[PDB]
Amino acid sequence: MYTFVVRDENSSVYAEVSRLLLATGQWKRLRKDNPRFNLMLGERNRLPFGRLGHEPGLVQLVNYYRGADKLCRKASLVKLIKTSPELSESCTWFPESYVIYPTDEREVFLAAYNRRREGREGNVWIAKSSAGAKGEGILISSEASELLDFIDEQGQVHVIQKYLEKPLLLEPGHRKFDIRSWVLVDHLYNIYLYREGVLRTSSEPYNSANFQDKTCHLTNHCIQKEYSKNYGRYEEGNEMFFEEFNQYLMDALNTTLENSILLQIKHIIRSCLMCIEPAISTKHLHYQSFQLFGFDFMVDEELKVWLIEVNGAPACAQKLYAELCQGIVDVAISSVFPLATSIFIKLHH
Amino acid sequence: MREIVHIQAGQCGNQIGAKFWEVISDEHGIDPTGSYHGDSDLQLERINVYYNEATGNKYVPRAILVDLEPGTMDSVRSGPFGQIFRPDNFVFGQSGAGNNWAKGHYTEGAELVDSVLDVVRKESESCDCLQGFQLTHSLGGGTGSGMGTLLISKIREEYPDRIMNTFSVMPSPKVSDTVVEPYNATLSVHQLVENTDETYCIDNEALYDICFRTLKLTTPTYGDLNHLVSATMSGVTTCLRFPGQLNADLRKLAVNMVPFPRLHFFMPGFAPLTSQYRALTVPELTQQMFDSKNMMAACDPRHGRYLTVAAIFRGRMSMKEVDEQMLNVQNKNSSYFVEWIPNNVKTAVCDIPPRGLKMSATFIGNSTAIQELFKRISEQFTAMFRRKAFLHWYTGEGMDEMEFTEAESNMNDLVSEYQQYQDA
Amino acid sequence: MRECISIHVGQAGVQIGNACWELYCLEHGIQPDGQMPSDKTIGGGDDSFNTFFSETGAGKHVPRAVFVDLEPTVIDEVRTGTYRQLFHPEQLITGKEDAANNYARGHYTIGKEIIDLVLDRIRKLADQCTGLQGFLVFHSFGGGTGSGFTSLLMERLSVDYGKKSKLEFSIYPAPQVSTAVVEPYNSILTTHTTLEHSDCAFMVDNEAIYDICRRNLDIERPTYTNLNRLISQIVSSITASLRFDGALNVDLTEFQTNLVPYPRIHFPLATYAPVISAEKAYHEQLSVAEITNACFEPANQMVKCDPRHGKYMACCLLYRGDVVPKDVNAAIATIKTKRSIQFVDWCPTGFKVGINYQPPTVVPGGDLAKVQRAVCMLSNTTAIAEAWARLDHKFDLMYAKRAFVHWYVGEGMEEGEFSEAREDMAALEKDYEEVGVD
Amino acid sequence: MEVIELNKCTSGQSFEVILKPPDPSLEEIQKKLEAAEERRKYQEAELLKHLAE
């Protein structure tokens, strides 16, 4: 029999994983502060990694990679991409980004900006922060002075990023979207891409002239339900799944989801996770880690994929919880603690 | 160095103590006349813990035998190993204690206690470095119960920084001599709460049930009960008496087993208990050890929580397998260990098995479930005291009801203190 | 030449000290009777090995050591063992009754009665020194003597030898090899009281030594004898610079200078490679690149923790055997490109290297195979604070219920010393965090 | 990657390689020990008083 503890009550994914583990009859849940566990479903913040793997005779597993925050913080991801030669300052799939404090790149940011507007180029940028949730601390603007003055009002560190001014628009609707991919990295550092993703679509016509109405520009599920009056019109909950999206690409653009988009997505996922593997791998450590990631992508009108951000504690689409959470138990948990056709694509390396 | 002084008081205390000395004398190679005839110097490496070396290569138990009537000690002196005891260490009176704690503690025992302390002092003075005392007694009679706890108080006065441990037989209505046993036991328990460092609670009903249900003895006798106790005492003291993992005197052992001074009442057990030549695997040994049927306080450990646990394995076996099995029982019993004493389950192995067994295991539990034992006694006490029944036997020896009221409150406080650490 | 005096306190300190001096004698060609044929100056010193051995007119080489235990059975083994002729009786101090795993009993109750005798025996060794540099102190964190009497000795050593360095080799408590339960108390209590008095302390977690012995030596159930022989190899690597010709870490002061920029943060992490079973019939010898890369594997560290998630303040590489600088630098270059090695901003990203050409000596009949080259890395990384966080948490669990506290109060200690010591540890954890996290 | 401070002898050699540039008095101890001894003595006196009652 196996023992596990729950320390993040707000996790929809691992509330379901915990439920499945009990329904096996071979897993037992202990109090959150009992140290004699096999599996820790850990807290989002300040997980005590230093106390894992010191209980004699217990193989201990945790659902977070210590150090994975560098990929999953906006300011931290920018620094990782600019300073890692595997990714480099020339990385073609990440938008031009700069870290700004209220080190800092404010002078370099204005430098590339000066060359941009002087050359009559598109000069719209979006400033965002990690500490800003619910799509509130976002500003899209083509005036640099307005972006920088906005940053100093807020307290936290910010990232200014080139706003994809030419996004691929779904039809009908002339509407924006982003692609969420779920990625599971097991204790062996196998990278598993869940075969089901989701498009979080805007239910408003994309309007390049006016950035003040953020509803047509921001694809967040909370924002579309809260502000778009056309919410749910074209698809339920502004969520389009891969079968429909692939069928659309075939009918409209005579291409497939696999060819036009998913090859790039797999390339990007692999590049990010292989980059930080030496810093976070638990291969020869006294405890083991797995983690579920949520990658967010943008697609432009040339069918080029851009990475937007990586979420270290993603939720899942409602109609996909059962399949994915079972896959977590299969691939990440039961692989270390065995019990008494695959939904993942293994990205090899 | 690390000498122990052993005291046995009253009928039960002397009959169990005599069996204890029969058992460990066999393990150490000492014949009924004190001569060594073993085959291994491992038998002698720590022989001084319990035996004095008299010239002529005779080994003499550091044992004192106390009673307020002569009958049981006459039987010991005529027993199998009756000759090994120092004749000067038989201290007895003639009146008896009439199963009366007051006669043992206040009148008859008070007249005899000074001469007992003379012998204690004589044995202590010949110890290179006395590490403490052990007492065997019952709580339900008069001499072991009343005079035994009087002795403990006198020893604490004269030797205030010496460890005092007891093997204490708790009365049960199902294995009972007189109706006043709950009175004597309740009065004694408060003495133990204050003046012992470890008290091994041996419930006579548990011993009886083991003999009847597990050993298939249709009509158990006190002798059958006492074979379980002497075997348990041998196992509990294995690591003091033989070379092995533990380099600990009684104080170090108590320091690590007793987190709160009053909660020092231990639940012992051992394995195997079988009705025979079959080999016991380490899984079987470990599983039986933690089974309530192999424990001797008649308390269900699932009704409380373990503060500390120690287990002693005897025989030639895999240490790696012992570790693996101790981890398996802990995960099955994960609810029943307090999580605020880290690593509170400890094990020790001794290569030398007891007589007749290739391997065995002895269990020492400090569990809050022992409160069930004190609740039983408290109920039986109150059922009579509420009507002041049989009290005249005690007021006739100078006691008044107030001292009974205070003993009742003290026991109910002890129970209450166990309940508070079971809910933490 | 400047002498060093070793002090071994409690069971762990005495048995490790016994294992170290055996190895020193093998490394220096000293027989168990004290004679040393290669030493052509009879009764007279000034060589590097004289920092640890004095000499008699009869030509015997006597360890500059004191063994102290509050109970005699461990030191009695020294008195009757192979190297019994090495030590004179005055160097072996034993009490009657130990501290019962109770810091307060080792520090206050028993320590008060023996501290002056111990200082008198140490003074006798100091009087034979022309230029004493200081002390090496071996002890467990968990024992009552190892924790309680050591902290008292360390305080009085600061008084009596104020300008002398003091180094510790401390055994950090591991449940796998301990039958005690109160060791988190003793560890925090002794660390709090010793912190100001120790210039540099090498912590060895019995858990790490135990697992190395299991994995690399194929010992299913390691004993103290197995653990101590491995620990003595690491101790020998660290002290070799004091005992042989060299230019790195040639006196105790250099340990603080090279490894400890901040006084309180004076616990370097030791990593050792290679550990190879002697029972292994066929073994391929490891290169300089391979043993140096092994220095960045947590599985070879004396304390399990993850240096990738801390920052370095100093890093020393101590090689024994067939090693030349060119191969060290080639190995360092490759490792820097492949592993996460981040220093604090106010320190140079660099390595101080020492090479001793004599390969490691191993005890005949021991568990370790002889190798052609070995290395001990000493790095001051903030990752070792993981070991403080573990200990402090076990402390907090027991102390919130005042479990076992009465044993300490009963020996004359006050409850306030517990929280005073725990608050010092909280400040120490905070210091490591300020240094190591952005 | 610079080597500095190379010293060589018959027993070995040492060097540095750089990748990147950037107490209580005796009387006070006696006070502590004697204060603890007095708290022990006071606790023992209470025990002996309790036994005398």
Ligand SMILES: Nc1nc2c(ncn2[C@@H]2O[C@H](COP(=O)(O)OP(=O)(O)OP(=O)(O)O)[C@@H](O)[C@H]2O)c(=O)[nH]1
């Ligand atoms: N590595 C190693 N650890 C030891 C050794 N002996 C004891 N220990 C560890 O030290 C701790 C127990 O402390 P001891 O050194 O035995 O106690 P002490 O210093 O003698 O003090 P007392 O309490 O008076 O006996 C436990 O964590 C043991 O695992 C040893 O020889 N080698």
Ligand SMILES: Nc1ncnc2c1ncn2[C@@H]1O[C@H](COP(=O)(O)OP(=O)(O)CP(=O)(O)O)[C@@H](O)[C@H]1O
């Ligand atoms: N450079 C860019 N160009 C165009 N659109 C962008 C953009 N950066 C962000 N967006 C839009 O903003 C939305 C939310 O951005 P972001 O992911 O930074 O905020 P967030 O982290 O709070 C939501 P989530 O956690 O689901 O990723 C995206 O869905 C995307 O449509």
Ligand SMILES: Nc1nc2c(ncn2[C@@H]2O[C@H](COP(=O)(O)OP(=O)(O)O)[C@@H](O)[C@H]2O)c(=O)[nH]1
């Ligand atoms: N296990 C066991 N219990 C006994 C024995 N003799 C008496 N008892 C129990 O001890 C209590 C009686 O105390 P006893 O020792 O006979 O009285 P004392 O001589 O005045 O101390 C009752 O609870 C009896 O059940 C014995 O030999 N073995």
Ligand SMILES: CCOc1ccccc1/N=C(\C)C1=C(O)C[C@H](c2ccccc2)CC1=O
């Ligand atoms: C610190 C943990 O200790 C142990 C760990 C593992 C296995 C056994 C241990 N041993 C204990 C607990 C013990 C005791 O507590 C006291 C026992 C006793 C009782 C009465 C008279 C004489 C001796 C003697 C005795 O071995």
Ligand SMILES: [Ca+2]
């Ligand atoms: Ca009379």
Ligand SMILES: [Ca+2]
């Ligand atoms: Ca008298």
Ligand SMILES: [Ca+2]
């Ligand atoms: Ca010489």
Ligand SMILES: [Ca+2]
């Ligand atoms: Ca100093």
Ligand SMILES: [Mg+2]
């Ligand atoms: Mg986000």
Ligand SMILES: [Mg+2]
């Ligand atoms: Mg009777």
Ligand SMILES: [Mg+2]
């Ligand atoms: Mg000791």
